């Protein structure tokens, strides 16, 4: 059967999903996530989109602002609109699976709604592909691949130039925040290869 999704859980509760096409496979994944981690996923959805203050109030208004200033939603939707049908099926199957369990929860809340929803006073909403994409963007790209302190670097460099004068301020900047250090221990050994690019080290853009 092409319609059937079989979900088997092991002795630690870990789910295994048996399905015949893409959409059904991700639909079962989404569904067990909603069963196991609904409040956590919902709070992560509000955290990655800056919609925390709506359910938790005034202490989260700066947080929500800072999250929305850090991305451009129409760019992510444009990327989802260009996927092929097989790629789109991963994202929509996952959200449809989550939604099937959310509909059952919102229909029988006396036994199915996670306690913390009652504690925090709100209820789960249905997901779309954009929401799934934004969980990865928000917790992976924005947590681990968005780091810069260039503006603060410049303020430091300026302060060192005042203190030690122009050429000397630069050389102390290179002593505290070197560009590369040839003695750093490396995952690839020098016998295998070295990086080929050499960069400017004098703030030559000024």
């Amino acid at each position: 059967s092409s319609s059937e999704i079989k979900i088997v859980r092991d002795e630690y509760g870990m789910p295994h999903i048996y399905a015949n096409d893409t959409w059904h496979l991700f639909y079962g994944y989404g569904y067990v996530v909603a069963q196991d981690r609904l409040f956590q996923m919902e709070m992560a959805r509000r955290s990655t989109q800056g919609t925390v203050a709506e359910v938790l109030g005034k202490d989260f208004v700066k947080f929500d602002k800072d999250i929305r200033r850090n991305y451009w939603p129409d760019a992510i939707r444009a990327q989802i609109a260009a996927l092929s049908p097989e790629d789109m099926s991963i994202l929509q199957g996952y959200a449809d699976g989550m939604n099937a369990w959310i509909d059952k929860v919102n229909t029988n809340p006396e036994t199915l709604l996670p306690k913390q929803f009652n504690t925090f006073g709100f209820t789960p909403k249905r997901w779309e592909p954009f929401d799934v994409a934004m969980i990865f963007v928000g917790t992976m790209a924005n947590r681990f691949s968005d780091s810069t302190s260039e503006i603060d670097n410049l303020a430091l460099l300026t302060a060192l130039k005042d203190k030690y004068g122009v050429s000397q301020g630069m050389a102390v900047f290179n002593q505290l925040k070197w560009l590369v250090n040839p003695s750093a221990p490396t995952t690839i050994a020098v016998q295998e290869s070295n990086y080929p690019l050499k960069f400017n080290q004098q703030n030559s853009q000024t």
């Binding site: 780091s147 670097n153 925040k177 560009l179 590369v180 250090n181 995952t187 990086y195 690019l197």
Partner: peptide, 26 residues
């Protein structure tokens, strides 16, 4: 292959964060 968020390879430059460095102590 071992890594603990150390430099990938000789002469590769690290993030520009002022608190982040790849040096002889790692």
């Amino acid at each position: 292959i071992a890594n603990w968020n150390n430099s990938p390879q000789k002469d590769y430059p690290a993030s520009d964060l002022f608190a982040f460095l790849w040096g002889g102590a790692d």
